């Protein structure tokens, strides 16, 4: 239909992060079936394709930020693919990798819809700046680059060039934050972006938290979502295999909620997994859990419904 | 600010308690370094040392209750020592140990503010009397002689000469019971004592609850609320490395989500971190949950919220 | 300038374990993480686990799960590594240096630069 | 376990020319490696940190490359002080091997 018509885009990049071995993202989780386990429900499944991620050798840092221009190459490469599959009429399933993809994941998802918006969902905001962060790692810094109220306050870092903020400081929602650096809950509480945090969410329910993202997003007026989706914004009890756990996310009944109730809007239009790390679980058994975990996830974004999913005939017969 | 302006009192004592370990309660917390994980956000820490526990070597029991003067004084010298961190402005952060000191812990802060507030978040309400329980183990009975509707009823239990009741039975909420022996459910019913355990948690959904707990301690009047918690309140899947673990606490989610909301009044007065014992780990890596748990708990007490902590510069630049 | 004094040599039988202090300076603690590597003589090196300094991140090796034990004493810049279940193939200098905190505040990294000057433990009875 | 092999096991190179390392992977650790000084005895210091860049008081000659199987370790200005047995090490796939040993001796 409208929905469940899906763009795969596998983006095994990993110089915004530190831990390499998210470069086996894609792999994984191509693995672990997920094409297949979309085609049981009416998922017209078409992959495109790797993207080659070019190694630029002289990736000299900046000030702080390091592997700038190969991030910054990634994700137009990924700017341009995205737009090319949303050009498609397709949703972009658009999994790496890392955050320093979601610029690019984002970026092409706003040169078709230039009024959508963003649930990022994630243990950490990732809204460090080139100035002050104190990493300098681009897994990160996507969402500074992507708000127009940042503008004229971002430095020319390389790699960026390309890079036009396009989407509102009113026009994203945090879920699930756990543990942020204080540069960016300064930027979080003086742009008034609406955020539900773990207190929000268990304060509201994650029920009336999304009843009420979906107020705040959708309820002005109906328009494009793009579920950029962590996985270590669940609890590292279901996600250790990430790159960065921090104890106390959401349970992955709750994280299977949130992709629910952005597919019963049908409003489903770019989804984005990321930090998906085979290579960090101390069992193989936890991979298995991580992996068959994000699988799921994907699966309850495009409708694999918990309440069920059908083909429209009689099966009485 | 007011808030996060902490006077940590580190408190190694065990006589209230059998299981002998607990006093390498605040070393194993400090050496996992909740002095520094305070420092980032703005936190005023003072350490003021911890309190030396003398030995009463002809510590002759009671009846049921045994150690009882060990108790008594240690929970007198606390008592003055929670009395002097509160002259200092600060936010008491009580941890130790055991229950036998929130005694003095309670008593101090009400030295200063005689209208507090007690969340006692514990698996137990650790409301038996000396004459009725059958364990004659301080660290469940703190809060029968804290309470003024129980006067004239407890006994003069040597080392209790100092204790006066401080606090009223309608002034106190339980948060998260799930072992209760029957003479502390008829204190709990008799009393009138709002309680919101785990059925009721489960009932109004946990932000409910903390919404209904902050509607009847702060819908009267703004006044000092002193969280006392318990680390075998949450589940035994997230700190098993406790002296009386009991299955089917909260969540570390929801234990976390209790801390935030006590944050975000703005009156969090006193806080006690207790029952916290390394020895009792089966695992190292048991322990190292346990002690990273209820380190955070204490940072999202202070203002270590997860939706973000900030300093009020632009950090786009 | 950036170092680490590590502390100190000693043999123990097959019983209880060396935790090996590890003194940092210099550089700014909990902003990188320390990690842990055996060399017997004459052989290879195995790194065997690090820790993030920034939160308890424990993240151990394979083959010693189990019997690594590692934490953080962040006060004083010092982190630390014990063993269990000790054993004569583990007569291995042990040096501790710093990977770098693979968190989100922490600096890129990824290459240990800080070397310990070593822990000479052969574990013989 | 990806096993980190250093083509020239030993070394004898006179105070003089480039000394050219080489240690290769069985996988693509893909730039994330560095290089150690190993003096007989003493603390490992860090020669060269993420496959090039030489890190925080090293002296003037030890460039080195990679990105990202087969990397270098060069000595262009000897400089007869670091006759030592050199180590790369991968870094950025667990469990972190190490090379075999670079014994650099004195060619004579």
């Known amino acids: 239909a409208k929905s469940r018509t899906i763009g795969i885009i596998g983006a095994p990049f990993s110089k915004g992060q530190p831990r390499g071995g998210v470069e086996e993202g894609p792999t994984v989780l191509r693995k672990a079936g997920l094409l297949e386990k979309l085609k049981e429900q009416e998922c017209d499944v078409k992959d495109y394709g790797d993207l080659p991620f070019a190694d630029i050798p002289n990736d000299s840092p900046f000030q702080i930020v390091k592997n700038p221009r190969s991030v910054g190459k990634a994700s137009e490469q990924l700017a341009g693919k995205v737009a090319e599959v949303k050009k498609n009429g397709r949703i972009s399933l658009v999994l790496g990798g890392d955050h320093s993809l979601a610029i690019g994941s984002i970026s092409g998802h706003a040169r078709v819809h230039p009024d959508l918006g963003v649930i990022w969902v994630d243990a950490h905001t990732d809204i460090n700046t080139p100035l002050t962060t104190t990493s300098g790692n681009l897994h990160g810094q996507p969402v500074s680059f992507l708000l127009k109220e940042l503008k004229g306050k971002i430095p020319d870092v390389p790699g960026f060039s390309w890079v036009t903020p396009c989407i509102s400081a009113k026009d994203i929602v945090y879920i699930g934050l756990r543990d942020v650096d204080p540069g960016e809950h300064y930027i979080l509480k003086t742009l008034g972006i609406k955020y539900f945090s773990m207190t929000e969410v268990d304060r509201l329910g994650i029920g009336k938290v999304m009843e009420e993202t979906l107020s705040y997003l959708l309820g002005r007026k109906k328009r494009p979502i793009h579920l950029s989706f962590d996985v270590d914004g669940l609890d590292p009890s279901f996600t250790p295999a990430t790159g960065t756990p921090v104890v106390g996310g959401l349970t992955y009944r709750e994280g299977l909620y949130i992709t629910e109730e952005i597919y019963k809007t049908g409003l489903l239009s770019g989804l984005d997994i990321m930090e998906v790390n085979p290579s960090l679980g101390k069992t193989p058994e936890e991979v298995t859990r991580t992996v068959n975990t994000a699988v799921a996830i994907t699966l309850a974004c495009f409708g694999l419904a918990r309440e069920g999913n059908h083909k429209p005939i009689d099966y009485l017969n | 600010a007011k808030s996060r302006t902490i006077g940590i009192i580190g408190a190694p004592f065990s006589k209230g308690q059998p299981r002998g370990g607990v006093e390498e309660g605040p070393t194993v917390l400090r050496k996992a370094g909740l002095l520094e994980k305070l420092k980032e956000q703005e936190c005023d820490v003072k350490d003021y040392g911890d309190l030396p526990f003398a030995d009463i070597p002809n510590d002759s029991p009671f009846q049921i209750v045994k150690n009882p003067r060990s108790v008594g004084k240690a929970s007198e010298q606390l008592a003055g020592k929670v009395a002097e961190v509160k002259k200092n402005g600060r936010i008491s952060l009580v941890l130790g140990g055991d229950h036998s000191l929130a005694i003095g812990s309670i008593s101090g802060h009400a030295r200063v503010h005689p209208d507090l507030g007690v969340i006692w978040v514990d698996a137990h309400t650790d409301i038996n009397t000396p004459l009725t329980t059958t364990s004659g183990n301080l660290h469940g009975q703190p809060v029968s002689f804290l309470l003024k509707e129980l006067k004239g009823k407890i006994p003069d239990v040597p080392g209790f000469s100092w204790v006066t009741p401080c606090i009223s039975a309608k002034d106190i909420v339980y948060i998260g019971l799930r072992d209760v022996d029957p003479g502390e459910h008829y204190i709990l019913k008799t009393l009138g004592i709002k309680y919101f355990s785990m059925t009721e948690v489960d009932r109004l959904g946990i932000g409910k609850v903390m919404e209904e707990t902050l509607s009847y301690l702060l819908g009267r009047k703004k006044r000092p609320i002193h969280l006392s918690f318990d680390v075998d309140g949450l589940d035994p899947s997230f700190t098993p490395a406790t002296g009386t673990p009991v299955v089917g606490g909260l969540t570390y989610r929801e234990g976390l989500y209790i801390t935030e909301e006590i944050y975000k009044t703005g009156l969090l007065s006193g806080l006690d971190i207790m029952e916290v014992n390394p020895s009792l780990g089966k695992t190292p890596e048991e322990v190292t949950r346990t002690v990273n748990t209820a380190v955070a708990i204490t940072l999202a007490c202070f203002g270590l919220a997860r939706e973000g902590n900030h300093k009020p510069i632009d950090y786009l630049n | 300038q950036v170092q680490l004094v590590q502390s100190g040599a000693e043999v123990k039988k097959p019983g209880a374990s060396v935790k090996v202090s590890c003194k940092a300076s210099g550089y700014t603690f909990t902003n990188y993480g320390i990690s842990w590597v055996r060399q017997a003589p004459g052989q290879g090196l195995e790194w065997m686990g690090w820790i993030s300094a920034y939160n308890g991140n424990t993240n151990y090796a394979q083959k010693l799960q189990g019997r690594v034990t590692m934490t953080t004493d962040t006060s004083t810049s010092t982190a630390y590594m014990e063993l269990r279940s000790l054993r004569s193939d583990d007569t291995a200098v042990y040096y501790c240096?710093?990977?770098?905190?693979?968190?989100?505040?922490?600096?890129?990294?990824?290459?240990?630069?800080?070397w310990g000057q070593g822990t000479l433990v052969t574990v013989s009875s | 376990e990806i096993v980190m092999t250093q083509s020239p096991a030993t070394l004898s190179l006179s105070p003089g020319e480039r000394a050219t390392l080489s240690c290769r992977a069985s996988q693509s650790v893909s730039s994330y490696l560095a290089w150690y000084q190993q003096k007989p005895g003493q603390a490992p210091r860090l020669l060269i940190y993420?496959?090039?860049n030489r890190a925080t008081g090293i002296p003037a000659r030890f460039s080195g490359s990679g990105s990202g199987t087969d990397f270098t370790l060069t000595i262009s200005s000897l400089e007869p002080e670091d006759f030592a047995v050199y180590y790369c090490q991968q870094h950025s796939l667990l469990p972190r091997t190490f090379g075999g040993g670079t014994k650099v001796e004195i060619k004579r």
């Open positions: 993420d496959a090039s």
């Open positions: 240096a710093r990977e770098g905190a693979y968190g989100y505040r922490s600096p890129y990294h990824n290459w240990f630069d800080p």
